Design a protein around this ligand. Structure first.
Ligand SMILES: O=C(Nc1ccc2c(c1)CNC2)c1cc(Cl)cc2[nH]ncc12
Lengths: 40, 154
C-alpha cells in the first residue's frame, strides 16, 4: 500500500484568520468525469 | 484515528509527495476521488479501505459511509483550512461566489493553492465541514476557483 496519511491539524474556525479572495458568479457545466468547464 | 485534517502522501513519485488532503470524522476518512483514485491508504501500521465513492461528485470515503452533511447557508463567510504541500495548515476566511449549473447553484471559493492541497476542508462558523476544496475551473487570470464539494450523509 503506497499512499499514507499524516495528521496536519484540528478542524476549528479561527477568529484570527486572514480574510481574502473574491466571490465570482460563474456559469459552469459538470461532465461525467467530474470535470467542470466554464460556459462562457 | 483522531478526528482532524490529514495530508495524503505517496512514495510512487520522487521522494515523498503530497497528492492531497482529507478529513477524519467519526472513524471515516473523507477526500476527493482524484487524490487517491480509490486506492487503499496506510495510517501507521493500519490499512484504510475505500467504502463509497463517485467520480462525478469527485468524492470518496474510507472505513464507513460519508459522514459530512453540513451545508453553506448561501450568505455567510467560510474558512478554507488549507494544507499545502510542505506547509503548515492555515485558515483563510472568504465569502464564496457561486457556480451556476443546469442542475442548480453551488458555492465556490476563489483561492489559489497548488493541486496537492485538494481535499482541504471548508468550514462554517461552528467548525462544521461544509465541503472539500479541489474541484473547479481555471479562470482567465490562470488562478483556480473551487466548488464547495459536499457529499450526502445516508
Ligand atoms: O486539478 C485539480 N483538481 C482536479 C484534478 C483531477 C480531477 C478533478 C479535479 C475532478 N476530476 C478529475 C486542481 C486542484 C487544486 Cl486544489 C488546484 C488546482 N489548480 N489547477 C488545477 C487544480
Amino acid at each position: 500500500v503506497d499512499m499514507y496519511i499524516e495528521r496536519a491539524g484540528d478542524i476549528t474556525w479561527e477568529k484570527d484568520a486572514e480574510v481574502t479572495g473574491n466571490s465570482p458568479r460563474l456559469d459552469v457545466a459538470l461532465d461525467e468525469s467530474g470535470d467542470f468547464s466554464l460556459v462562457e
